[PDB]
Design a protein around this ligand. Sequence first.
Ligand SMILES: [K+]
Length: 405
Amino acid sequence: LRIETQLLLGRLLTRSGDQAWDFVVPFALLVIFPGKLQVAAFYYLIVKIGTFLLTPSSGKWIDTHPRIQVVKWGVWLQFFAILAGMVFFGMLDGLVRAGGRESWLLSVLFIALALSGVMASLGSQITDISVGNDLAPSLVAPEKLTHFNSWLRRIDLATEVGAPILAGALFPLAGLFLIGLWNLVSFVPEYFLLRNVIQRSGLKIKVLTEAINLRGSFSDPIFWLILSYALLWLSVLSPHGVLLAAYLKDEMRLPETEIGLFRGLGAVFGLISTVSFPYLVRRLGLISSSRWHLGFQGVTLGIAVTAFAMGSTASVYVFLGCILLSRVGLYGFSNGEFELRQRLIPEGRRGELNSLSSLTTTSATLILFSAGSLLPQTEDFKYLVYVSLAAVLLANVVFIKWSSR
Ligand SMILES: [K+]
């Protein structure tokens, strides 16, 4: 295998395990604390807030250590976080099965679980930045990055579609530990693949920074590109969106069978961007392809939101169809912004400025989570819809302004 293929193979193996694990954790939480959806929510919250708080530090840590150290800590932090998580899950499940109720002990084990979730999430973010935003632009010719990124996207979508299937086959909570085990094992090929390409090549030579402040990050021009991407995470208009599903079910009275297919079609339209975006790049260049895809997301969601406004079931399939089309735009733009970060971010600032990107997208996630919790009613879904559209149009404005560079 050539270098580029080794990178993709490593990503494919470790992701299939990551996606399988992320899929089953909420269900495992619900098995242990039956009914209590607030507990699963609390888990997710701690992980995200935790990752948020550790992000600037981790980006400085990335720029000040050799790559082989970054990859070692990135992967093995995950490995041992997942192992710790499995141990705490087992303990929790054992405790509750044996009749344990609310206690400091049970609480302490939940916190230990949630913190291990923070470590894994942070390790994963470090590894993504390292492989996708440092190793890849250092190993792959600039003109072949678009091709390389489209395969990274295909791996992400494929393992995303394969996750419920994998999990299904393997699934009290015995399925969880089998998924945990597969996840553990799936970290190992990527560690050694990465370690061996670093050991044998010029990745060893890298000037490190000695030895937060975020003023330097936010003041950099690339932050506006970063903001144009992050804004897209604010939307409730997604195939997987829980508030949209709730809305479609109660207000639109769509059958649950049609809602599930809609949800499942997300991946397909994501996959379509991996053909449309590279095609436009090769024809119009990276900036122009990005602008067209982002505009396509803006137009299709504009149409979808007009169809939502005249709130008839006579317009519901155009609403859903346009949301699905918009995913082509979103997934295309996401590869473009990713590639612009690969190409434009100085080598010595790869940890810093890409962690800024993680910081801003995690913030968007937290806001979206906050809005979901604050406006949980289907009759209020209307307001989240208009703010989602506004965010997308603002993203277009910000990117157009930025791409005047
Ligand atoms: K993994």
